[PDB]
Amino acid sequence: MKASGTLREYKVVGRCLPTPKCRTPPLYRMRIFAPNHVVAKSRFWYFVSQLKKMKKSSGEIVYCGQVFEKSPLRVKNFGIWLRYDSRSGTHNMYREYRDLTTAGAVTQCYRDMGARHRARAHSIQIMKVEEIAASKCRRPAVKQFHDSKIKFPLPHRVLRRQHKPRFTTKRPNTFF
Amino acid sequence: MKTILSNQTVDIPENVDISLKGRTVIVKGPRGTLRRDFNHINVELSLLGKKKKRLRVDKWWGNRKELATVRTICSHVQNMIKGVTLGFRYKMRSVYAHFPINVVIQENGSLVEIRNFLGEKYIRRVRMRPGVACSVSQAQKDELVLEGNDIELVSNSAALIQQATTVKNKDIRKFLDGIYVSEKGTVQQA
Amino acid sequence: DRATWKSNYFLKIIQLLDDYPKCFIVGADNVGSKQMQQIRMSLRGKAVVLMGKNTMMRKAIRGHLENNPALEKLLPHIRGNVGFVFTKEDLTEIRDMLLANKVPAAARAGAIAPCEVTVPAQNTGLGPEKTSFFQALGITTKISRGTIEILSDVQLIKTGDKVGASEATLLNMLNISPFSFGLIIQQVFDNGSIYN
Amino acid sequence: VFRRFVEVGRVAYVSFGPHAGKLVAIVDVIDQNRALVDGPCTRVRRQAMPFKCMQLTDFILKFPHSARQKYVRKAWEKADINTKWAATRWAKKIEARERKAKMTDFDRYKVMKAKKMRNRIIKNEVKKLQRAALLKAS
RNA sequence: UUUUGAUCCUUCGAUGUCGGCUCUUCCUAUCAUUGUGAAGCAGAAUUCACCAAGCGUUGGAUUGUUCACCCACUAAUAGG
RNA sequence: AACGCCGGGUUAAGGCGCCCGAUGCCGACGCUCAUCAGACCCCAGAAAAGGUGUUGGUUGAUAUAGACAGCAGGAUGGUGGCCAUGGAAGUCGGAAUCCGCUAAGGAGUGUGUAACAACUCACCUGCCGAAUCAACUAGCCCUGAAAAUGGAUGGCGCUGG
RNA sequence: AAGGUGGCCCGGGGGCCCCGGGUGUUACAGCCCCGCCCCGGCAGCAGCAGCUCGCCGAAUCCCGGGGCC
Ligand SMILES: [Mg+2]
Ligand SMILES: [Mg+2]
Ligand SMILES: [Mg+2]
Ligand SMILES: [Mg+2]
Ligand SMILES: [Mg+2]
Ligand SMILES: [Mg+2]
């Protein structure tokens, strides 16, 4: 699965269809991160297939809805649990990112895993996403930001709109 | 990771009078002046406080490579203070087994002629660095004394004479000849 | 584990400190543990001796400051090679015994000198040996028929000087310290009352 | 030798994007390169905005790092930032820039004639001053 | 890929097939020389390794021989 | 992707420093410095094993009731421990491995010793004040990496790409 | 409860004022959660506060400009 743009979070539930043996099978819920309801339903089927005797053909999906960020203007610290396949072997992780939304964070995880491990999106499975408090946050890149009087400058300021003149007299300054 | 901030202060004594044009530092005091350029290093050198009691040196957004350049400055400045106030006396004793090394000083301690090393006809006309004062001590048979403000120039000139008197093609574990540094200290103690 | 032994130290420090309110803050400086067992053997029943981690004492005492303020003056006192010497029996005799009891150990070639160290004129106690250790320094040593005899007395080390190995060797041979390793008194403390 | 610092409460001028030409306060910090921003009185919604685009001034309206928009509106009106802004020379050379884009052809002609005259007067007075300095020298 | 073999895509209306002589340049996996490290390196003599291929590496008896073996000098009588 | 001869529009697989039509986006997040760097199916070449180069992870110990270096001082007592043996008295084998002061002290790391001497080790006081230590794993780079006319990521060149 | 605002203590910078450090829970700054007040009540509404996040038009129509024939 390509992670194009930015993910949504969807609440998928489904079930096996009735049979003469059991007239009312239990419903099953998941939390799929995906761009759309089509790839959501597909990934749902893959996980259910890994755990339960259940295929898309033998069953049906009852409900796929989008789930909004209930607190979008608060800032949060998300804590993700992973499962990734190496070139050689598989490995579990626990990674902390610092974002506003579940989706923004998951995106950031994908991009980081890609940088640091060249892990391609299909290999990865998401198993738990928990918002975690500053007290319980372990990783020092996060821990440094919890401070009321944070302060820093912008030192070296690389110019943008380089080509708009392309030809000036004055050499550009970057110190303000 | 990108560390948001590092800094380290050096509380200087009242005798010295530093000043700075940006990165280039100048330090004056009793024994003389000392300038030193840091333009390669890229840091914030704040000279805050009345009585000029302390230097502070910030470093915003540094990684592991860039954090190492703070304490190195701190130390280079401290040694500069020693060089302006007290100075640097590098002692070094001439070791030999059988053949005695006839040493002689030229140009009021700038130059050093070293004769009869292992009975070699070649003679080592070693030149000291600028701002260095060679001198044979008194009350000691085999004793050079190199005085000066800059430790760098002193110590390099020391190694110059040391590597100049080196035994080629021989078992150095046995033939323990040549000049060797013994005691590093200052002109006046504190 | 280290965390539980530390909390155990807090279990000793609170019970003896609350029950017994009186300490002699003596300083066990470089004294050996065998010498310590002889002094503990002397003050086995009556006294109860203590050392530990400086911050371990800092928080045990900060805990004491809520209930018993008597240990408020102790916080600055545990500094240098310092330890408490809790005691119920008597104050002046334990003070004199603690200042006295020192076993003369070997002379250290290296530590600082408070006062002048001395080298008396006395025979070596050997056969024909190398005179260069004594004649290097500047002491008159004669060969009284084979056996070496010392002519004149000279004081080698002065107040505040590093003890070399050569100047150390004669104290190592005699095994007689000028000043013994020991336990130095700091202050007396009787129920919230300092004695200099 | 840094003079302006990113401090919660500091005002920034928006260079480009959708919200160009607008003033806005830095409410909070997320990371090295992304901050929470809001400008209630200038018609800008509470939103994320990277430090890249913005360029910070020397004004620091005071409020807590997580203060909800009410206390910001009151503190903004209380300080009266907008007027001090309009006093700044900055804004004046911005309005000049814009008037120069708006420049009409008739105004362009009147201006050319104004220049022509103002510069002939200056040329006369300056030449008399140079002969005056020669007179002073002589 | 300096041996040898395995293969048959190219040429049989013809690519002159073994050795020596003469001559140029080229590679380095350094025999010797220059500078240096290590040795169960005291000095001498001798071993191992790094930079380095710019300059050198012979005269003869026997065999068509390449190869082989031997005498003599050498700093060295390295390999392609 | 398949073709009669043409005008207009749009696309595929590929691409957009300049050669060479097109980003002269205020494009987003990160990694990496190589005195042999690296650059897109088939493709025209390299590995096992390393690295206190660096970036992340896992597990297990340690931590503000405050370590771990560091400088110093002790750096040892039952005890020549019993069984082995000839001796393990700290230092072939083999049995031992409990106790004391305790801040801590093994029937002992090395030099040096049949074991001591001499130098020396684990363990802790003095000061010191926040995070520290060990073993694994995978990411990039590096070592491992030699052949003959002068030479080829297509060239020029490229290190906020 | 705290990423601790005023108060208190220690420092460090000025001779009553300014800057670091330490306890702590609203006080002249705030944040977090439960219950009850007609889903508490008021506009407005995928918001010209011209881009905080989407999917659509029998639940949708209009106007304008260029090119070729
Ligand atoms: Mg064929
Ligand atoms: Mg032919
Ligand atoms: Mg022919
Ligand atoms: Mg080579
Ligand atoms: Mg030799
Ligand atoms: Mg091309």
Side-chain angles (χ1 to χ4, degrees):
Chain A
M1 185 168 71
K2 295 185 164 299
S4 289
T6 81
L7 297 91
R8 284 81 171 283
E9 210 184 86
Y10 290 113
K11 183 166 91 166
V12 187
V13 310
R15 64 198 198 103
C16 174
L17 47 66
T19 53
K21 187 172 179 206
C22 264
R23 302 292 182 78
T24 166
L27 285 72
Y28 290 117
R29 173 168 59 80
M30 294 194 65
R31 282 161 54 77
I32 310 307
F33 291 93
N36 60 66
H37 67 97
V38 180
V39 315
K41 287 203 283 272
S42 305
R43 279 301 272 185
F44 170 83
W45 285 125
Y46 160 74
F47 288 138
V48 166
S49 293
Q50 204 83 329
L51 296 165
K52 302 289 184 169
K53 280 280 207 304
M54 189 182 288
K55 311 172 84 192
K56 184 168 72 64
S57 303
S58 64
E60 71 183 314
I61 279 164
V62 176
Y63 159 75
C64 164
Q66 184 163 356
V67 42
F68 316 108
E69 224 49 2
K70 174 74 167 294
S71 319
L73 309 178
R74 278 171 54 191
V75 52
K76 280 158 279 164
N77 316 321
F78 300 97
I80 307 181
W81 281 268
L82 275 282
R83 161 157 97 210
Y84 87 110
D85 199 348
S86 298
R87 297 196 217 296
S88 49
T90 65
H91 300 97
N92 299 341
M93 298 230 201
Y94 167 77
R95 299 277 264 184
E96 176 89 33
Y97 300 109
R98 188 164 151 74
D99 211 26
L100 315 191
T101 64
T102 42
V106 170
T107 304
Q108 196 176 331
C109 187
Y110 272 95
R111 301 295 141 80
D112 188 24
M113 269 297 190
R116 294 188 149 75
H117 308 276
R118 285 79 177 75
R120 317 316 169 93
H122 68 78
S123 184
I124 297 154
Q125 301 162 235
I126 311 307
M127 53 171 60
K128 196 182 178 191
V129 184
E130 195 184 341
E131 85 160 3
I132 286 172
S135 302
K136 299 180 180 182
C137 273
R138 299 152 56 181
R139 304 303 189 205
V142 182
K143 290 167 76 63
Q144 74 178 234
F145 296 109
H146 297 144
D147 180 359
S148 182
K149 291 86 79 175
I150 192 174
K151 178 174 175 282
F152 52 92
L154 312 175
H156 196 295
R157 292 279 273 184
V158 59
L159 288 164
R160 302 297 177 185
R161 69 174 156 166
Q162 298 152 31
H163 293 90
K164 166 53 68 210
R166 193 167 337 179
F167 300 99
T168 193
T169 317
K170 66 184 186 172
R171 283 187 151 76
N173 176 44
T174 159
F175 189 84
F176 311 109
Chain B
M1 77 201 177
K2 296 177 104 188
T3 297
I4 194 162
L5 167 62
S6 59
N7 57 339
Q8 189 165 14
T9 55
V10 185
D11 297 17
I12 72 164
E14 297 202 11
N15 297 181
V16 174
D17 185 50
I18 70 167
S19 180
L20 67 166
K21 188 178 176 186
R23 294 182 180 183
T24 78
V25 159
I26 72 169
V27 178
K28 71 192 80 175
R31 297 175 56 76
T33 67
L34 279 182
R35 311 187 73 267
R36 202 171 194 279
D37 53 293
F38 282 88
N39 289 21
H40 57 78
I41 210 69
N42 195 339
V43 299
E44 178 186 22
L45 294 180
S46 307
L47 180 49
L48 70 94
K50 186 157 279 188
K51 314 173 185 178
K52 330 314 283 185
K53 298 200 293 185
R54 57 184 96 168
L55 180 61
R56 195 262 294 285
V57 45
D58 295 345
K59 176 66 166 78
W60 301 96
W61 300 121
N63 50 302
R64 193 156 178 283
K65 291 175 81 171
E66 278 152 349
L67 298 174
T69 63
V70 179
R71 182 156 142 69
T72 193
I73 296 166
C74 157
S75 296
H76 281 310
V77 168
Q78 277 175 208
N79 295 342
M80 207 178 298
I81 285 160
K82 282 181 174 268
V84 165
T85 52
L86 313 186
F88 283 96
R89 185 195 297 281
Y90 272 59
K91 301 182 181 174
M92 54 214 71
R93 304 204 73 177
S94 170
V95 183
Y96 62 89
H98 180 277
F99 292 107
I101 302 160
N102 280 316
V103 184
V104 59
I105 51 158
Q106 299 182 344
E107 292 288 312
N108 56 52
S110 193
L111 186 141
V112 177
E113 289 272 18
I114 310 179
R115 309 173 189 283
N116 195 57
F117 171 72
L118 269 291
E120 279 182 357
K121 265 57 192 180
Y122 181 60
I123 50 175
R124 277 147 270 273
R125 290 161 186 177
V126 182
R127 203 163 192 78
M128 280 300 127
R129 306 286 262 189
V132 178
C134 177
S135 54
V136 174
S137 61
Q138 279 62 27
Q140 269 284 23
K141 50 168 189 301
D142 296 31
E143 175 77 20
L144 285 62
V145 173
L146 314 190
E147 286 182 48
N149 307 358
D150 202 323
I151 194 175
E152 295 283 18
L153 308 183
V154 168
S155 61
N156 180 55
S157 53
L160 285 178
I161 66 167
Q162 189 164 299
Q163 293 189 323
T165 60
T166 49
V167 195
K168 317 304 291 185
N169 202 322
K170 298 292 194 61
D171 182 38
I172 180 170
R173 292 191 324 263
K174 204 80 174 190
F175 292 78
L176 300 158
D177 299 341
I179 299 160
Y180 296 109
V181 175
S182 171
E183 196 274 316
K184 310 182 182 179
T186 58
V187 174
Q188 54 180 233
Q189 283 68 23
Chain C
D1 304 278
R2 187 144 58 261
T4 314
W5 176 80
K6 293 186 199 182
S7 302
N8 198 10
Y9 192 88
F10 279 71
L11 296 165
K12 286 180 179 178
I13 198 71
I14 195 57
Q15 190 47 83
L16 294 163
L17 292 163
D18 202 332
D19 193 353
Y20 301 98
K22 183 161 62 55
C23 184
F24 272 62
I25 306 166
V26 309
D29 178 31
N30 291 47
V31 77
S33 57
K34 186 211 160 296
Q35 296 176 47
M36 287 283 288
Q37 286 178 11
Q38 289 180 5
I39 296 158
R40 270 82 180 283
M41 285 281 287
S42 60
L43 308 172
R44 52 160 290 286
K46 68 194 172 182
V48 179
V49 288
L50 189 69
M51 300 293 291
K53 193 85 80 171
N54 44 356
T55 55
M56 186 166 278
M57 266 88 78
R58 281 163 167 282
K59 205 159 177 300
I61 293 313
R62 182 170 278 179
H64 266 278
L65 306 199
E66 64 70 34
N67 33 0
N68 291 314
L71 305 68
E72 64 177 290
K73 195 81 181 315
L74 298 170
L75 290 166
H77 284 89
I78 301 159
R79 287 294 187 182
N81 204 332
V82 174
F84 297 134
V85 180
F86 298 169
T87 176
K88 64 208 184 289
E89 190 179 313
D90 52 15
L91 64 141
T92 312
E93 290 286 30
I94 297 168
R95 191 177 171 282
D96 180 357
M97 288 180 32
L98 289 159
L99 186 61
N101 47 25
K102 298 186 185 181
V103 186
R108 192 80 278 178
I112 309 169
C115 196
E116 298 189 68
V117 179
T118 56
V119 179
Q122 78 78 40
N123 64 285
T124 53
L126 294 169
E129 209 162 53
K130 285 78 171 181
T131 58
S132 58
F133 291 101
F134 298 106
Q135 301 284 108
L137 291 163
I139 311 173
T140 53
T141 61
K142 177 74 150 199
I143 311 177
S144 73
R145 290 262 296 188
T147 56
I148 302 161
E149 190 255 328
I150 304 92
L151 281 289
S152 57
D153 43 15
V154 183
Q155 299 281 29
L156 301 172
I157 300 160
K158 275 72 172 181
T159 56
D161 191 318
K162 181 288 186 179
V163 180
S166 59
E167 72 190 331
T169 305
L170 209 51
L171 291 163
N172 294 17
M173 293 283 287
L174 294 164
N175 198 327
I176 299 167
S177 182
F179 179 87
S180 49
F181 286 126
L183 33 69
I184 62 161
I185 198 171
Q186 188 64 241
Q187 280 305 294
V188 191
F189 183 80
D190 281 19
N191 260 320
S193 194
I194 195 69
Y195 298 168
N196 285 188
Chain D
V1 280
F2 306 104
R3 284 148 56 259
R4 291 80 156 281
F5 291 83
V6 172
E7 216 291 336
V8 54
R10 189 169 288 284
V11 183
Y13 175 79
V14 182
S15 64
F16 69 93
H19 307 270
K22 296 186 167 174
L23 288 176
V24 81
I26 292 168
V27 172
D28 212 340
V29 178
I30 304 166
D31 283 329
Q32 200 265 299
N33 52 7
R34 209 173 78 174
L36 260 315
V37 165
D38 187 36
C41 190
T42 40
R43 311 181 300 168
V44 180
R45 295 273 191 294
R46 176 70 68 89
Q47 60 198 284
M49 202 187 71
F51 293 133
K52 280 188 75 89
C53 89
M54 69 215 304
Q55 40 180 4
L56 77 188
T57 68
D58 52 353
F59 293 109
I60 38 165
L61 182 47
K62 189 172 71 61
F63 58 92
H65 68 83
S66 70
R68 78 190 183 76
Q69 181 164 313
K70 188 168 182 176
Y71 309 112
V72 176
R73 195 199 307 275
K74 284 197 283 190
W76 190 283
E77 295 167 319
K78 175 173 175 65
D80 198 348
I81 306 302
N82 287 15
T83 57
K84 289 204 295 294
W85 178 244
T88 319
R89 297 174 81 268
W90 198 334
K92 285 184 292 196
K93 68 184 147 170
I94 297 310
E95 56 75 20
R97 199 100 55 74
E98 205 69 43
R99 281 175 181 178
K100 199 174 159 182
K102 267 74 183 183
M103 197 194 286
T104 320
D105 71 351
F106 175 53
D107 294 339
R108 191 172 312 108
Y109 166 84
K110 283 190 292 189
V111 153
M112 175 269 262
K113 297 294 192 182
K115 275 205 188 185
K116 194 185 281 182
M117 202 53 198
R118 185 270 210 298
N119 292 5
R120 260 169 177 73
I121 290 161
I122 290 164
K123 202 88 64 179
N124 288 325
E125 185 64 27
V126 65
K127 194 176 284 183
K128 288 199 294 180
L129 261 68
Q130 67 179 1
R131 67 173 179 77
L134 188 65
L135 188 68
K136 293 174 72 174
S138 62

